[PDB]
């Protein structure tokens, strides 16, 4: 995991996106490409359209899933069985 000194890594794009999203207390679907961005308690209500590789998966953040990264909730490989 990332070192504690450096602070959590959140991309600036979706950062300013969520500050402009929460300033009026409305949570519309936000579409992003940065899977590497962690989850901040400022994302508690917002729902992200996180990229997968083909499309964007909708992920509704909760209190439980804070501290993880977005890419956890956008599974890439599709395997059903042989």
């Amino acid at each position: 995991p990332r070192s504690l000194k450096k602070g959590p890594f959140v991309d600036d794009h979706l950062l300013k996106k969520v500050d402009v999203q929460n300033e009026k207390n409305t949570k519309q679907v936000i579409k992003t490409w940065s899977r590497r961005s962690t989850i901040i308690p400022d994302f508690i209500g917002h729902t992200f359209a996180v990229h997968d590789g083909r499309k964007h998966v909708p992920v509704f953040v909760t209190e439980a899933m804070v501290g993880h990264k977005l890419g956890e909730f956008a599974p890439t490989r599709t395997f059903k069985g042989h």
């Binding site: 504690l4 959590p8 209190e63 804070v66 501290g67």
Partner: peptide, 11 residues
Amino acid sequence: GRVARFEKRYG
């Protein structure tokens, strides 16, 4: 609470 774990981890 996970949020408290964030605060103690990073603050």
